[PDB]
């Protein structure tokens, strides 16, 4: 919880990132998303996870832009994007808004996905339902498979049990559990003040606006007590990824990481995976952004040459 900073004046503040992002009407709401536009023959879509937004990739994507068009959305109800029409933020709602947003970008026939946390789950489900439209998948700290046991996982069993209970709604909707504590705790360095302000801005008020950060962990695919529909989704796409011999993949392990130790064994039963690793915990983008970007850039280059 201690932490100390690094180097400051290459910073991208919140408003600095948002003044570079675009917006677009999707279904009965709107999506905010960064777009590099150039080299539109390929599209790399960056999908953040819980407690974060597109801001998370701000220092990662400058490496991949000279070779492909990179689009990075704020998921619905998060970041600068609009809210979901019915106010619910389960996995399939994010999937609905995201797949509707996909139609309006004039994407290529094959898309590369760079997913983190639950964005990796969105990319995996979209790949399972559109198996031919995937050129490559890069994932990290991902929802790789269902959770049968807590052995190699971080000590979060009681945390998850409390979140799934009625305790979660005063844990996060009022005291902002995932933004005020989890997010700084899972970053190796101390975030500069405006960097944390950018993350807190969408959820700086108590109430239902922080609901997307409560519903994401309630989706966790445990075989015991987890939402049966989400466990079915994860089983399906995990089997598909295990069978995807022709799909190039890149796994960016985090050292020591957060989920990486518990998920590498599974992320690993997927063929055609190039394994790299960078220093960091969960939100590895704030610890090793340039190295991660160089890895993704060389991976995309090698995918595009064959």
């Amino acid at each position: 919880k201690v932490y100390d900073p690094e180097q400051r004046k290459r910073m991208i503040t919140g408003p600095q990132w948002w003044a570079r992002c675009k917006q677009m009407n999707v279904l009965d709401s709107f999506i905010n998303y960064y777009d590099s536009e150039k080299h539109a023959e390929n599209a790399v879509i960056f999908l953040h996870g819980n407690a974060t937004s597109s801001y998370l990739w701000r220092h990662v994507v400058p490496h991949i832009e000279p070779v492909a068009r990179c689009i990075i959305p704020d998921l619905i109800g998060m970041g600068k994007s609009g809210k979901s029409g019915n106010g619910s933020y389960r996995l399939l709602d994010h999937y609905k808004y995201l797949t509707a947003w996909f139609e309006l970008l004039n994407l290529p026939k094959k898309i590369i996905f760079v997913g983190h946390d639950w964005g990796a789950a969105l990319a995996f489900h979209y790949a399972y339902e559109h198996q031919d439209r995937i050129k490559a998948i890069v994932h990290m700290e991902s929802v790789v498979d269902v959770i049968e046991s807590w052995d190699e996982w971080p000590d979060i069993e009681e945390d998850i049990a409390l979140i799934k209970s009625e305790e979660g709604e005063k844990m996060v909707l009022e005291n902002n559990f995932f933004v005020e504590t989890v997010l700084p705790s899972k970053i190796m360095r101390k975030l500069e003040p405006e960097e944390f302000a950018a993350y807190l801005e969408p959820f700086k008020e108590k109430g239902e606006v922080r609901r997307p950060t409560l519903s994401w962990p309630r989706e966790i695919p445990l075989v015991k007590g987890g939402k049966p529909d989400v466990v079915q989704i994860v089983r399906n796409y995990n089997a598909y990824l295990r069978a995807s011999d022709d799909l190039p993949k890149l796994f960016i392990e985090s050292d020591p990481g957060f989920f990486s130790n518990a998920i590498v064994e599974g992320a690993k039963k997927f063929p055609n995976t190039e394994f790299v690793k960078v220093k960091g915990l969960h939100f590895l983008q704030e610890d090793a952004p340039d190295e991660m970007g160089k890895y993704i850039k060389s991976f995309v280059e090698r995918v595009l040459k064959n």
């Binding site: 201690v2 100390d4 190699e152 915990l281």
Partner: protein, 229 residues
């Protein structure tokens, strides 16, 4: 008489730490004051090289001077007797994870200032352990057993990191303190009770600031009149 030792009751101090955790080299520095008769101290630690740390800071908290120990009259103060020249210590830490750490430090006296130069080296840190995971909120109070071995003093300690889950994670720390000069009397078996806390850490500062109180005493349980030992 403190003045004869070259010390005053309230002493400033400057510390320079060169550390290597795993394959990460770093250098920190500390500035502080303290009371060597009552046993209080507060140091402001900042990372001069190696920032940011890819591990928990609190592992070097014990590395950042037993001169700040409140020794009563009925127990000899081996560390205050050790001045003007100062004293050194070699410290071995085994985390219950299985990883290890070695801390060798020299405490000297310069212009009414405790000049502490300390070397820290950790290895075999478990990936899912609280040190690598950085789950550590701070240190709990401790009881360090102090006894005499020939011309040196030996202290053994069980330090407990509190974790944000409320759980605890311990490490066994054995320190051999050696005075640079001989001393007139070596102490009997006793304890030094420690509480090390982080005081101003709430500021969005790039430095930690820790305060340790250490008071020496014998056991508070009465020895049955003529028992062994």
């Amino acid at each position: 008489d403190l003045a004869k030792l070259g010390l005053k009751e309230v002493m400033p101090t400057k510390i320079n730490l060169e550390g290597l955790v795993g394959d990460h080299a770093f250098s920190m520095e500390g500035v502080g004051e303290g009371n060597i008769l009552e046993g209080t101290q507060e140091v402001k630690i900042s990372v001069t090289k190696g920032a940011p740390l890819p591990f928990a800071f609190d592992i070097v908290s014990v590395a950042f001077n037993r001169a700040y120990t409140g020794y009563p009259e009925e127990i000899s103060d081996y560390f205050l007797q050790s001045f003007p020249e100062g004293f050194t210590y070699e410290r071995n830490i085994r985390y219950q994870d299985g990883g290890t750490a070695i801390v060798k430090s020299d405490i000297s006296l310069e212009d009414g200032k405790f000049i502490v130069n300390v070397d820290f080296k950790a290895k075999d840190l478990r990936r899912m352990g609280p040190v690598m995971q950085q789950d550590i909120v701070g240190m709990q109070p401790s009881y360090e057993s102090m006894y005499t071995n020939v011309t040196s003093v030996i202290g053994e300690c069980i330090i407990a990191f509190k974790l944000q889950t409320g759980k605890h994670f311990t490490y066994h720390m054995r320190t051999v303190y050696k005075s640079k000069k001989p001393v007139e009397t070596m102490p009997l078996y006793h304890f030094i009770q420690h509480r090390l806390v982080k005081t101003n850490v709430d500021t969005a500062s790039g430095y930690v600031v820790q305060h340790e109180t250490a008071i020496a005493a014998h056991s508070t349980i009465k020895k049955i009149e003529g028992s062994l030992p």
